[PDB]
Structure 1
């Protein structure tokens, strides 16, 4: 029986507020329940289903109109003697509670998605109990990958020279300059192993050859391109190299699925959102804060769930044909990269100071979204209320 507070250690919040996480899940569900609605997917596999885009994907297909049954694969840990548990751990639990209330299947595999054991387990469940899958979304954003037993670690670096610029320190409400430098050859390769398209492709092949995909099944992975201002990181750097690998694999998966089941694969390039991993990378967080202000002013702002909802209802499962860019990618950053939006961001950038940034950018919204990632600062949650830790320990995914 304890009060959970937001304690910052080396820039990151230590604990998560589980009921704040519940509320965030519920806010996304609410958005989807009230949106125009779409139809299509019935049986959906999501690898990386516990947070961010994977979670929004799951909520969207379940509550956004299709009433899809879902399998979520994620590695998360619960409450112990000393730890409260990860946000994703709770997101899984609360998603399942709300999905079942609607009479939907919401299976969780709390498992390392990279291992052959996990694939076998998921495949067995599909063949035995779930039924064939019409949509497979790969949205794992793991920091490392275990293979023999080599461990590969993702890094966020340039391939040449320094990248430096402002980050947002949420704890002190200030801008702070940071720098990241060049990656080693091994670091580039490891990042490609973790973030590239290899595991996604393995999944698609196992699923395909084990007769787990429905005819005409779709599979999707997520990426980010952004503005030229951060190309050194997101296109040219270690992340950019991994994402090009992801894009290349999408093409090979697409060709195969098309030939074998009339299915398809593609990368959806999404918009800038606040995440833990991009906090403290130089120059992105300020970009995002300014972007939020501009797009909110222009009535075109989207958070994670809004991105996904529009992706599904307006582009993927719409009446009209799907439009890809010239490299076969679905572009959900079409509003972010709109000329008028980028012109305004660059203008504000040229006036922004460490002194005035809270007025020229959406620092408030940036900070709120950051806090929300650990279940803090959610409207309608009583943070003075103590939490029953033995009750939380009882919850099962």
Structure 2
């Protein structure tokens, strides 16, 4: 029998690589009691590692939805990340709790809050960053769709299995899809978490909460500012204000949206035009030593913009812009320069495809220096592993 999409110890190592980046950094202080929804991967994971080993030596509750190994299956990356982060966190004497539940349901929130007042203590930083393809409740099921609102979006995607470009297309969304996508990817559940945490008295005074977005360049506005994702994110952005206002009154805190930069996801892999833009961008930004990955993105966000000596610099919209380096004039030009020369035949050498692909396999624990791949694994060893 063979591994599939996830390597369990490549996952250990990847978490560890991000921990080691954090341990070595200039270090910051601020949060001590931290709640993350969507803690098992991407920014949730990086945020969790950045607050635990960034030097705040903070305690964390991760909410995430993942499954593990049975005698037949191997389980998800996020599942293993949760386990290894616990392991490495307890070894440092920090609390890492794991609720592996549906975050959208009330009986989950009640589990979480119940846990906070009883054992954990007042949360000082709340990060909401779950990306689900679907939601529940009531008893209805809403599905998230990546679509336009008018016309078509076609552009190149990257087939990492076959190292080639494929032109893929995205059509227009029905009114209800526009609406299901807003229930999933908008800031409603965020808002409801926030409120229930506030009134059940779980926010430390001046406490902070973020949610994460993406804006992109004009090339992708049809999708990210105009489409079903853009409408979901403009809703999220809107709820940011309605919470900033509240927590500022009741407990003197703040809420806001952080606009992250272009990163390689699985879910970003089959949106048109973005895989290729990001691979180009990766090159551009590497030949300017300003490329950042997920953990550098978050480290920088905390130790320079949120929890630094200086005062917090917001955009003209109440949004923290961590895509500031991505959207710099010189950088965008160079992408637009390279874009017009890219072909299905030469793309591998005009964009940082290598790095783009490396970063894909790494999410899943593949292609990592520090791991023995030809080695075999034991299924009974992975199942006994618990969060």
Q: Aligned equivalents of 2:187 and 2:335: distance in 1? A: 32
Deviation at 1:372, TM superposition (A): 1.3
Deviation at 1:395, TM superposition (A): 0.5
Q: Is the 8 A contact 1:225 1:269 kept in 2?
A: yes
Q: Aligned equivalents of 1:114 and 1:209: distance in 2? A: 18
Aligned to 1:268: 258
Aligned to 1:54: 44
For residue 38 of structure 1, give the secondary structure of its aligned residue in structure 2: coil
For residue 176 of structure 2, give the secondary structure of its aligned residue in structure 1: helix
Aligned to 1:373: 363
Deviation at 1:15, TM superposition (A): 2.6
**Equivalences, count:** 387
1:198 to 2:188 alignment: yes
Q: Is the 8 A contact 1:372 1:378 kept in 2?
A: yes
Cα–Cα, structure 1 residues 12 and 286, in superposed 2: closer, same or farther, change >3 Å?
Answer: farther
Q: Aligned equivalents of 1:197 and 1:14: distance in 2? A: 34
Mapping for residues 146-185 of structure 1, pairs under 5 Å: 146-185=136-175
Q: Aligned equivalents of 2:2 and 2:182: distance in 1? A: 26
Q: Aligned equivalents of 1:202 and 1:344: distance in 2? A: 42
Q: Aligned equivalents of 2:91 and 2:150: distance in 1? A: 52
Cα–Cα, structure 1 residues 141 and 13, in superposed 2: closer, same or farther, change >3 Å?
Answer: farther
Deviation digits for residues 43-77 of structure 1 (CA, Å, limit 9, x no counterpart): 00000000000000000000011000000000110
Deviation at 1:373, TM superposition (A): 1.9
Deviation at 1:378, TM superposition (A): 1.1
Deviation at 1:14, TM superposition (A): 4.5
- Structure 1 residues not aligned, in runs of 5+: 1-10
Give the root-mean-square deviation of aligned CA atoms. Answer: 1.5
Q: Is the 8 A contact 1:15 1:84 kept in 2?
A: no
Q: Is the 8 A contact 2:149 2:226 kept in 1?
A: yes
List, as ranges, runs of 4+ consecutive aligned residues in structure 1 with deviation greater than 4 Å: 11-14
Q: Aligned equivalents of 2:72 and 2:168: distance in 1? A: 33
Q: Aligned equivalents of 2:3 and 2:354: distance in 1? A: 17
Q: Aligned equivalents of 2:270 and 2:315: distance in 1? A: 30
Deviation at 1:81, TM superposition (A): 2.5
Deviation at 1:220, TM superposition (A): 0.2
Q: Is the 8 A contact 1:13 1:374 kept in 2?
A: no
- Structure 2 residues not aligned, in runs of 5+: none
Normalising by structure 2, we get a TM-score of: 0.99
Q: Aligned equivalents of 2:99 and 2:201: distance in 1? A: 20
Q: Is the 8 A contact 1:78 1:393 kept in 2?
A: yes
Deviation at 1:371, TM superposition (A): 1.0
Q: Aligned equivalents of 2:184 and 2:110: distance in 1? A: 20
Deviation at 1:170, TM superposition (A): 0.4
Deviation digits for residues 111-154 of structure 1 (CA, Å, limit 9, x no counterpart): 11000001000001100000000000000001110112100011
Aligned to 1:250: 240
Q: Aligned equivalents of 2:301 and 2:312: distance in 1? A: 10
Aligned to 1:300: 290
For residue 383 of structure 2, give the secondary structure of its aligned residue in structure 1: helix
Q: Aligned equivalents of 1:231 and 1:385: distance in 2? A: 45
Q: Is the 8 A contact 1:48 1:73 kept in 2?
A: yes
1:127 to 2:117 alignment: yes
Deviation digits for residues 182-216 of structure 1 (CA, Å, limit 9, x no counterpart): 01111010000000000000000000000000000
Cα–Cα, structure 1 residues 17 and 58, in superposed 2: closer, same or farther, change >3 Å?
Answer: same
Q: Is the 8 A contact 1:41 1:134 kept in 2?
A: yes
1:76 to 2:66 alignment: yes
